[PDB]
Design a protein around this ligand. Structure first.
Ligand SMILES: N#Cc1ccc(COc2ccc3cc(S(=O)(=O)N[C@H]4CC[C@@H](C(=O)O)C[C@H]4C(=O)O)ccc3c2)c(F)c1
Ligand SMILES: [Cl-]
Length: 435
């Protein structure tokens, strides 16, 4: 693509918007930047030569543009963007800009749950093969920060929002891991509209990897599949042991993995299918499955002391992810479950089936705390903040108990990001969980 001479407007700053600014400047194009936030992150890092408009959108700038580069954090359906689209003004995002430039194959991963774990695992599979790999997207670096002539493979985590603005992805291997209700605040035509955004990832993919157990992951109209009891890649249970299999052949006894739990085993299958499709050697891919320890904030034991396990699952930002933490969970004593934040208009009802019995207490906070407490009011407490919830539950914790932050919500109503929520939980767990 050639941007020389174009009037380019970037909506959204932060590290990603900065990477877009830097991308254009390095190509001799000075873009303009706008952000609905008065003081967005990275503002002090924006060179003064770049004009900026903050605190609102500027329709004079948008309607004047030759190209609008929209952060995934702004809806295409925003009236100002729909007006520009109606006028024939091209709108793309950073992932589109990246795909037009990339000179190595791309493995592309989306889904409601599991996408960071699978992206990271395929990255580690590539590293173990000695491949020069760039891993990022919706995690790690913004994708444009990965671009490098020496890179031999890119592995991108892509969100539904990024996919809505991307048209030139031709992945060597692409997956939707699963589709469960999320982001309803951004999808007023509901689950199928969200699904449609993720289905874009398969367009012009060489290999599509689908979840045999989740029909919403399949194109509307020749994919490789993974699943539990069925799929090209599947699990084989042998007498209190589980194996990863490919078409009937055992490839790994999961006792060799550091990750545990069925959904992490299907994550491993999906990662293997993608790596296989990308041409990585099977042996080194399997080795990476044995070395990978997990991501921070993803069902992470932050303290195990005095008979109590404190688990930071701050990355559980939707109902499906909390369900994955709760389904089959073993707790000797009482589960003290922290829920709360911005639930993005989700129905939390599917969680209620895990919340019966005498051994569960809920501590509900943030914007949607009241809705969460309503799952089972008899065992629920509501506070404004997560710190208040922790200070309330800690005196009640007994040897054998579990304290689980798996909040089913985004963090942005009260936190910078889910990592800050997790770090704050870990600090408080260490304070409250020893004498
Ligand atoms: N104009 C403008 C403008 C343009 C961009 C931004 C910010 O850049 C983004 C880019 C993506 C965004 C995505 C969401 S989200 O509702 O999908 N929430 C997710 C990202 C934050 C995560 C966290 O809690 O750390 C949770 C996550 C999720 O999936 O819930 C929410 C806000 C997001 C903001 C912005 F704040 C303003
Ligand atoms: Cl029980």
């Amino acid at each position: 693509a050639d941007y020389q001479g174009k009037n380019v407007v970037i909506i959204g700053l932060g590290l990603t918007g900065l990477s877009c600014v830097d991308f254009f400047l390095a190509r001799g194009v000075t873009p303009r930047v706008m952000d609905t936030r008065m003081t967005p992150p990275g503002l002090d890092k924006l060179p003064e030569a770049v004009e900026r408009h903050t605190g609102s959108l500027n329709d004079e700038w948008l309607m004047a543009a030759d190209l609008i580069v929209a952060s995934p954090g702004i809806a295409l359906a925003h009236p100002s963007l729909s007006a520009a689209a109606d006028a024939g003004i091209e709108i793309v995002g950073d992932i589109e800009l990246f795909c037009r430039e990339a000179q190595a194959p791309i493995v592309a991963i989306t889904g409601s749950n599991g996408k960071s774990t699978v992206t990271t695992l395929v990255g580690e599979m590539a590293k173990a093969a000695g491949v020069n790999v760039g891993v990022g997207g919706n995690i790690g670096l913004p994708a444009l920060m990965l671009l490098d002539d020496e890179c031999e493979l890119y592995v991108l985590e892509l969100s539904s929002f990024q996919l809505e603005t991307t048209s030139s992805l031709q992945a060597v291997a692409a997956t939707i891991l699963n589709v469960t209700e999320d982001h309803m605040d951004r999808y007023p035509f509901g689950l199928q509209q969200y699904r449609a955004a993720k289905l874009r990832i398969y367009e012009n993919a060489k290999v599509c990897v689908v979840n045999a157990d989740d029909a919403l992951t399949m194109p509307i109209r020749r994919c490789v599949s993974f699943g539990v009891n069925m799929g090209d890649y599947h699990l084989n249970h042998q007498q209190g042991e589980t194996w990863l299999r490919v078409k009937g052949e055992k490839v790994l006894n999961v006792k060799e993995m550091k990750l545990s739990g069925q959904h992490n085993y299907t994550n491993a299958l999906a990662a293997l299918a993608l790596a296989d499709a990308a041409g990585l050697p099977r042996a080194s891919s399997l080795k990476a499955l044995t070395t990978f320890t997990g991501l921070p904030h993803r069902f992470e034991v932050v303290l195990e002391h005095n008979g109590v396990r404190w688990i930071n699952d701050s990355k559980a930002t939707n109902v499906g992810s909390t369900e994955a933490a709760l389904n089959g969970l073993h707790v000797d004593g009482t589960l003290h479950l922290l829920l709360g934040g911005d639930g993005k208009s989700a129905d939390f009802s599917p969680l209620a089936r895990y919340l019966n019995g005498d051994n569960v207490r809920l501590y509900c906070f943030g914007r949607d705390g009241a809705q969460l407490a309503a799952l089972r009011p008899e065992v629920a407490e509501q506070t404004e903040t997560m710190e208040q919830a922790m200070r309330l539950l800690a005196p009640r914790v007994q040897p054998g108990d579990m304290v689980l932050l798996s909040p089913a919500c985004a963090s942005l109503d009260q936190f910078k990001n889910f990592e800050q929520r997790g770090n704050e939980f870990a600090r408080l767990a260490k304070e409250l969980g020893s004498h």
